[PDB]
Design a protein around this ligand. Structure first.
Ligand SMILES: [Cl-]
Ligand SMILES: [Cl-]
Ligand SMILES: [K+]
Ligand SMILES: [Mg+2]
Ligand SMILES: [Mg+2]
Ligand SMILES: [Mg+2]
Ligand SMILES: [Mg+2]
Ligand SMILES: [Mg+2]
Ligand SMILES: [Mg+2]
Ligand SMILES: [Mg+2]
Ligand SMILES: [Mg+2]
Ligand SMILES: [Mg+2]
Ligand code: NA
Ligand code: NA
Ligand code: NA
Ligand code: NA
Ligand code: NA
Ligand code: NA
Ligand code: NA
Ligand code: NA
Ligand code: NA
Ligand code: NA
Ligand code: NA
Ligand code: NA
Lengths: 46, 65, 119, 56, 194, 81
RNA sequence: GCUUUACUGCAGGCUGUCGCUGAG
RNA sequence: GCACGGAGGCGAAGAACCAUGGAUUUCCGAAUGAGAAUCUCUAACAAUUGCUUCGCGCAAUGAGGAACCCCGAGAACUGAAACAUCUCAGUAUCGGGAGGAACAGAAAACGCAAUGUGAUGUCGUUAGUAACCGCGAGUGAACGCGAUACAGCCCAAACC
């Protein structure tokens, strides 16, 4: 497919939201990313 | 911090702009050092640089430049 | 048009307007269809002017027949703004009534004659 | 040809996409109309009383 | 003595007689070639207009609107219906043509508000009404002690809410006694039974 | 108002371009054209920009590969920051 | 759901009449 | 900040924090220069209107809002132990639109008929009364009264 500049921005964001909760945040909160999205098992929008 | 509001108002419109372009540069160089994984950082400043720039722009607006 | 049953030659209209102007200065004139209608009804009208470019025509339709059953003479003018200017207004006028001429009762009385003859 | 699984293979057509006005993946790129907010069809926002129970 | 206006009124009592009859026969020919809503410089029935609130003043507008004659232009049912509701031909709208005319004029002038309206005749298939609209934002109207009331925010879109002349009569609000039980203060408050 | 240059893009690949091709790599505002990038870069580092290549990245930012003239030395321009 | 000389109605078609609509 | 880490910083130049007012406020969005799945292309009140110095010069409209409110369009399941009028119901749902509340409102009223009442909402009652109805099932007011709150005016025309 041919993605536009805006679509590319959105997918970039989705990839970024796909990171894990940083380790330091665990220590800072004394203790999960519910928005984890696999490319195969999940489907993005548009 | 190192730059107070009184001191910004005691500047001439031209000194704020010169001071402004100066802060932007310190900022840009801090981001470069950061982008290079540079550790000689001091987080409290890259944050102060932003606020200082905001103050100057706020004052430039209040004074009429 | 529907209330116009005879055509007034250009030259006659000029004499009429001219007379009207000397009427506002020397005698008395009523400007406006409502004030004109009242002249004819009160009998104080000697010569009434009615424009022919009036739209809606309803505003003046009654002048003719009313004037007839009151003996009052009437003449048609083509331009609404000419009658108004002649009457002394900055605006136009659908109808005017020379209420007692002035230094024109002659020329006037004769214009009434020319029209009566114009059938 | 089976209307089930075998007919699912030709589905590589893009229709509903992220809408510019409401953010939902409901902007039908073929019709240029959002089935969720009405963008492309109505200046007013799409909304109906049947979207909730009658007395609520 | 009789006002000149009284003559316009008298003529319109019988629009199919005398001179007016001929004017109409003339006029309609041009009207039928005109659009749905046409702004006119002067009211065809001056007495009527002034009587309704018209003034030769800035911000006062008049427009003639054409509306088809007859009953409801209704689509026949596409699903189950009991005999009583299968109707098409005899169904008529609950809003009179004059009111439809007022709304169409008003939509053409989004910034203006309807003051009142009156009939100017009809032919075999049209009905014509002239609507008087007012510019609530024009000073001259804002400063007129007789029309300024229409400038109030509470009056935005009067026609669409039936606050008009024809609106109130068509709503059954004419009588203050017998017959207005389901009418006043509003049709909706009375469950919509009038 | 947004600024053209955001920060130097420093990665292994950016180094090779700097050391072997006299090019500098930046993260710039995605609304910036090659021309705007060329100008901004010259005014900030006092150098002569010979060519700019851009790319809208999968990071959501724009990357510009700015080649300097033989008169300028990328290695040195980058060493002062 | 379907049918028809089942019951009752509703579109549609035909036809008279009134309005548009006037002169001898 | 939630958020208790690591590093570093700010605060007696009175920070944090709270109140009020101001600044900033990307893109799409009624979305308004034009086009577009939030981007792009070469000055913009697009569109419809009022005024008009007839020039977008001065203005209006658009869209939103928990429900409430006003004006239009308007079912069927159901009840009648079937069903057609009736009923469900002017309900559900749809179209248009206002406000902080709407709407109504100073009698071509009422008609305890009077030597009487006196704008309009609303609440209590009048009353399941009068009235409607395959006179079946069902449907269903008002005047008055006791309260609440109270407020009365402007044009058109005559004559100028
Ligand atoms: Cl209105
Ligand atoms: Cl009483
Ligand atoms: K039924
Ligand atoms: Mg990755
Ligand atoms: Mg199938
Ligand atoms: Mg109410
Ligand atoms: Mg490229
Ligand atoms: Mg646009
Ligand atoms: Mg039953
Ligand atoms: Mg029975
Ligand atoms: Mg009922
Ligand atoms: Mg009663
Ligand atoms: Na996938
Ligand atoms: Na309007
Ligand atoms: Na009724
Ligand atoms: Na970056
Ligand atoms: Na079946
Ligand atoms: Na803000
Ligand atoms: Na505007
Ligand atoms: Na203009
Ligand atoms: Na039953
Ligand atoms: Na049955
Ligand atoms: Na019945
Ligand atoms: Na009593």
């Amino acid at each position: 497919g041919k993605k536009s500049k805006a679509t590319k921005k959105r997918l970039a964001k989705l990839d970024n939201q796909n990171s894990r909760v940083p380790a330091w945040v665990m220590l800072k909160t004394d203790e999960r990313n519910h928005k984890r999205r696999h490319w195969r098992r999940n489907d993005t929008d548009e | 911090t190192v730059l107070h509001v009184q001191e910004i108002r005691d500047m001439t419109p031209a000194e704020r702009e010169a001071e402004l372009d100066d802060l932007k540069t310190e900022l840009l160089n801090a981001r470069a050092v950061q982008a290079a994984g540079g550790a000689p950082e001091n987080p409290g400043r890259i944050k102060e640089l932003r606020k200082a720039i905001a103050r100057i722009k706020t004052i430039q607006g209040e004074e009429g430049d | 048009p529907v209330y116009v049953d005879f055509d007034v030659p250009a030259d006659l209209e000029d004499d009429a307007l001219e007379a009207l102007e000397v009427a506002r200065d020397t005698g008395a004139v009523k400007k406006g269809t409502n004030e004109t209608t009242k002249s004819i009804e009160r009998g104080s009208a000697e010569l009434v002017f009615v424009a022919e470019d009036v739209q809606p025509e309803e505003i003046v339709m009654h002048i003719p027949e009313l004037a007839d059953e009151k003996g009052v003479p009437f003449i048609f003018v083509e331009q609404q703004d000419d009658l108004g200017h002649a009457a002394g207004l900055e605006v136009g006028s659908a109808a005017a009534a020379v209420t007692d001429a002035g230094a024109a009762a002659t020329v006037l009385e004769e214009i009434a004659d020319k029209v009566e003859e114009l059938r | 040809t089976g209307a089930g699984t075998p007919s699912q293979g030709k589905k590589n057509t893009t229709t509903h996409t992220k809408c510019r006005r409401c953010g939902e993946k409901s902007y039908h790129t073929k019709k240029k109309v959002c089935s969720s907010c009405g963008f492309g069809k109505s200046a007013k926002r799409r909304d109906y009383e049947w979207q909730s129970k009658a007395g609520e | 003595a009789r006002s000149a206006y009284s003559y316009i009124r008298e003529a319109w009592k019988r629009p199919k007689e005398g001179q007016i009859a001929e004017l109409m026969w003339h006029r309609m020919q041009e009207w039928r070639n005109e659009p749905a809503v046409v702004r006119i410089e002067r009211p065809t029935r001056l007495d009527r207009a002034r009587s309704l609130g018209y003034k030769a003043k800035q911000g006062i507008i008049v427009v003639r609107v054409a509306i088809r004659k007859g009953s409801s232009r209704r689509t026949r049912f596409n699903k189950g219906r009991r005999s009583k509701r299968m109707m098409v031909n005899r169904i008529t709208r609950k809003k009179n043509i004059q009111r439809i005319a007022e709304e169409r004029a008003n939509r053409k002038f989004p910034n203006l508000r309807v003051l009142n309206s009156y009939s100017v005749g009809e032919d075999g298939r049209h009905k014509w009404h002239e609507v008087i609209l007012i510019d609530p934002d024009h000073p001259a109207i804002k400063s007129d002690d007789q029309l300024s009331w229409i400038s109030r925010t509470r009056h935005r879109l009067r026609t669409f809410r039936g606050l008009t002349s024809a609106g109130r009569r068509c709503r059954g609000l004419r009588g203050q006694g017998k017959g207005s039980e389901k009418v006043r203060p509003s049709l909706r408050v009375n469950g919509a039974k009038a | 108002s947004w600024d053209v240059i955001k920060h130097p893009h420093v990665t292994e690949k950016a180094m090779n371009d700097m050391d072997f091709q006299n090019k500098l790599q930046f993260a710039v505002d995605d609304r910036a054209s090659k021309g705007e990038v060329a100008d901004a870069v010259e005014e900030q580092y006092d150098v002569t920009v010979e060519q700019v290549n851009t790319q809208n990245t999968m990071d959501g930012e724009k990357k510009a590969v700015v080649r300097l003239s033989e008169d300028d030395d990328a290695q040195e321009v980058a060493s002062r920051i």
